[PDB]
């Protein structure tokens, strides 16, 4: 693409600059260019990729929710006909969101996942695959909605299986994966009991492993454990 002529190292440098400038669309385009160089990503570079697209799609999701709310209000009883504009603009944002998700899923499929052999990279990419199918599922309404949901589930499940075999229960990637798969259960799969069970079991097993950790690893793990607790408090 348009980044084909820029050095891989320069793309990574500029992704970091874009993050400092809060220019997340730029950050994501730089990291897309870096991935398309075809070399595997380091731990730090995987973080840059995920931060960039998380911020881009997060803004799109927030906007889509605002517009969907307005659209559903317009379809209530006693609401005045305002024309097709709300649906059109919600569809515009929705299409842009789907485009970003398809781009990320394309990077994972070509060819990040198939070259990821270590648990830390493979679980990370499969969690991402689950996340971006989850975002597609949030806006899905058509013939393939169940298949999108199952694509998210399958990716999360493979990541979970690897993480339980190959990572300690305090590993932040394992914890973050469980956090998000639990939200998938609660918000996408209509399975609140599974969501609560997963968050609780993940929290308790991490708690019992904290004694093995340094001060800095303890900080990293307890940060995500608190998010598990926050969700459990929201749900119970």
């Amino acid at each position: 693409g348009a980044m084909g002529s820029m050095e891989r190292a320069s793309l990574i440098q500029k992704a970091k600059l874009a993050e400092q400038a809060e220019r997340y669309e730029d950050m994501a385009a730089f990291m897309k260019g870096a991935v398309e160089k075809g070399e595997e990503l380091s731990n730090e570079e995987r973080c840059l990729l995920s931060v960039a697209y998380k911020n881009v799609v997060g803004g799109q999701r927030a906007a889509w929710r605002v517009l969907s709310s307005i659209e559903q209000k317009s379809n209530e009883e006693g609401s005045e006909e305002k024309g097709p504009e709300v649906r059109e603009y919600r569809e515009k944002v929705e299409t842009e969101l789907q485009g970003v998700c398809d781009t990320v899923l394309g990077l994972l499929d070509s060819h990040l996942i198939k070259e990821a052999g270590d648990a830390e990279s493979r679980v990370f990419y499969l969690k991402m695959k689950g996340d971006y199918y989850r975002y597609l599922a949030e806006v899905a309404t058509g013939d393939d909605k169940k298949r999108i949901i199952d694509s998210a589930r399958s990716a999360y499940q493979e990541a979970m299986d690897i993480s339980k075999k190959e990572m300690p229960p305090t590993n932040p990637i394992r914890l973050g994966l469980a956090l998000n798969f639990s939200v998938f259960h609660y918000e996408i799969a209509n399975s609140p009991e599974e969501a609560i069970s997963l968050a609780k079991t993940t929290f308790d097993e991490a708690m019992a492993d904290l004694h093995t950790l340094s001060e800095d690893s303890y900080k990293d793990s307890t940060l995500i454990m608190q998010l598990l607790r926050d969700n459990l408090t929201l749900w119970t």
Binding site: D131, G176, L179, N180, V183, Y186, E187, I224, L227, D230, N231, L234, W235
Partner: peptide, 5 residues
């Protein structure tokens, strides 16, 4: 909304 990372 619930927390995700």
């Amino acid at each position: 909304f619930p927390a995700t990372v």
